[PDB]
Amino acid sequence: RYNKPPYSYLAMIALVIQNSPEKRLKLSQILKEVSTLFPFFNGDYMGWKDSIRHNLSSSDCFKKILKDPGKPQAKGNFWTVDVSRIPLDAMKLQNTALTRGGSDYFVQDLAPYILHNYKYE
DNA sequence: CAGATTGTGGATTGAG
DNA sequence: CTCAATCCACAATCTG
């Protein structure tokens, strides 16, 4: 357990994918857009990059984009979230000891910004 | 071609 | 109890 923002990785990835131009994003583009939106990874640790890559494959919300039907074994494909399938309790703010008080720092729920067309600060 | 990155997924941990 | 976070491993493409 390392210092990460109190939002599930699923909601973090789902946000940057919807906030993107064509609602598709490559792994690297997901990595840097997540890092700047939730600026709590600019330190020494690096394993959070794996956790995101692992979350994309291990969730049925995220699907790949087929570049070439002749090479379906290709990598670097853009990922697309399918918002309707995101459990509503996965977007709420994570109950940790960091959010015992002073919670006014972070929003309570990312559903408006993910599936309701609102702007995240 | 070596080294970096992607995609997958099996297994353990700490915490709620 | 449960489950997100983290670990570590392997396979295979991607890049220069």
What DSSP string describes A9-48? Answer: HHHHHHHHHHTSTTS-B-HHHHHHHHHHHS----SS--TH
Is strand C within 7 Å of residue A116 (CB)? no
Q: Hey, what are A90's tokens?
A: 């996965």
Name the domain count of chain A.
1
CATH classification at residue A71? 1.10.10.10
Nucleotides of B under 7 A from a protein CB: 5-10, 14-16
Amino acid (1-letter code) at residue A11: A
Where in the sequence is the domain holding A83, given as residue range(s)?
9-96
Does some domain include residue A92? yes
Is strand B within 7 Å of residue A79 (CB)? yes
Q: What's the sign of the alpha-carbon dihedral A65, A67, A73, A76? A: negative
Question: Method used for this model?
Answer: X-ray
Q: Which residues contact A115 (CB under 8 A, 6 or more apart)?
A: A18, A83, A86
CB atoms within 10 A of CB A115: 16
Does some domain include residue A60? yes
What is the distance, to the nearest Å, from the Cα of residue A37 to the centroid of all Cα atoms in its chain?
Answer: 10
Give A76 CA → B5 C1' in Å. Answer: 9
| Beta bridge pairs of residue A109 | A92
